Scaffold this active site. Structure first.
Site: not given
Ligand SMILES: CC(=O)Nc1nc2ccc(Cl)cc2s1
Length: 342
Positions: A38, A154
């Site tokens: 988003g 990550d």
């Protein structure tokens, strides 16, 4: 035509407007961030009287469910901080607004990728790299807390943000790709440049993959350029090999994707498959860092804290972070005791 009564777009993103005021509380300033999840927006919270960063998750079951996993880990972490001494971004609260889950974070400054860019990808000093390295190592120690055992999964410069633009304090963001240590569900993980050998080799993984990513990041912060810029997995592995040599036989004998990169000779030894590259182990970190030649491209010649002896400590720490063997690879606690941090 209309989605969520006109509030959402094609990608199920909430359509942000400057000046909008949610819940008689948050005054929306501008879009500051975007991703698969988003958007992220800068907003002034009128109740606490401060700027915040609100992460607006897309209006779709898939992204909602992912983001509620992020919420659970954040609340779990922030519950083992309270004082905020461990350099994880702080989740203040969350709420639903017009069918979007919103996560309210403390507002932070630039990320470390922006810094690199601001140097024109020539790097920051060894002194500043030390400070980021110390904090990151403390963050990884925190994550290794037994009841947490979280893998960020990550780590990369753009997911490390400065608290304040005039200070060197950092926070790790984006726990949306993160999971706790468990049985192996996922295999295509980490961002390529920072992807560990175990993952490239389809092997089991643990918190040590974050430490590999950190070694890669730290060299990049100082050189300005990624250590291993693979255009695909094969090129990634080849760029690792140039620097660190062929991975040990006992690893490759257990690797399900060994043969994506290497080939077993009749005597049980492994070489690279030809597809370009310097021979294995001949692009030495010592030379990449410019230990004896004034740092990267000679740009730190004469600068204080950039002597041979300073660089050798840095080099030795990174090689311990870039150990092929995840079980031998340096752990956070011992990394903090390295002579680089005296
Ligand atoms: C973009 C910026 O200047 N500051 C930011 N601060 C934050 C804080 C939390 C998250 Cl998830 C993202 C951002 S982006």
């Amino acid at each position: 035509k209309v989605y969520n009564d006109g509030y959402d777009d094609d990608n199920y993103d909430y359509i942000v407007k400057n000046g909008e005021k949610w819940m008689d509380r948050y005054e929306i300033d501008s879009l500051i961030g975007k991703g698969s999840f988003g958007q992220v927006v800068k907003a002034y919270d009128r109740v606490e009287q401060e700027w915040v960063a609100i992460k607006i998750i897309k209006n779709k079951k898939a992204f909602l469910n992912q983001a509620q996993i992020e919420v659970r880990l954040l609340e779990l972490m922030n519950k083992h901080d309270t004082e905020m001494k461990y350099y994880i971004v702080h989740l203040k609260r969350h709420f639903m607004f017009r069918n979007h889950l919103c996560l309210v974070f403390e507002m932070l400054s630039y990320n470390l990728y922006d810094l690199l860019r601001n140097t024109n990808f020539r790097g920051v000093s060894l002194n500043l790299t030390r400070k980021f390295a110390q904090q990151m190592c403390t963050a990884l120690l925190f994550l290794a807390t037994p009841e947490l055992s979280i893998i960020h999964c990550d780590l990369k410069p753009e997911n490390i943000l400065l608290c304040n633009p005039k200070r060197s304090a950092i926070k790790i963001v984006d726990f949306g790709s993160s999971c706790q240590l468990g049985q192996r569900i996922y295999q295509y993980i980490q961002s390529r440049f920072y992807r560990s050998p175990e993952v490239l080799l389809g092997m089991p993984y643990d918190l040590a993959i974050d430490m590999w990513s950190l070694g890669c990041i730290l060299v990049e912060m100082h050189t300005g350029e990624p250590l291993f810029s693979g255009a695909n997995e094969v090129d990634q592995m080849n760029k690792i090999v140039e620097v660190l040599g062929i991975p040990p036989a006992h690893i490759l004998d257990q690797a399900p994707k060994a043969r994506k990169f290497f080939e077993k000779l009749p005597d049980g030894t492994w070489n690279l498959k030809k597809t370009e590259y310097k021979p294995p182990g001949t692009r030495k970190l010592h030379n990449i860092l410019g230990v004896e030649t004034g740092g990267p491209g000679g740009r730190r010649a004469g600068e204080s804290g950039h002597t041979v002896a300073d660089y050798l400590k840095f080099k030795d720490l990174i090689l311990r972070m870039l150990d092929y063997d995840p079980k031998t690879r340096i752990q956070p606690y011992y990394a903090l005791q390295h002579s680089f941090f005296k």
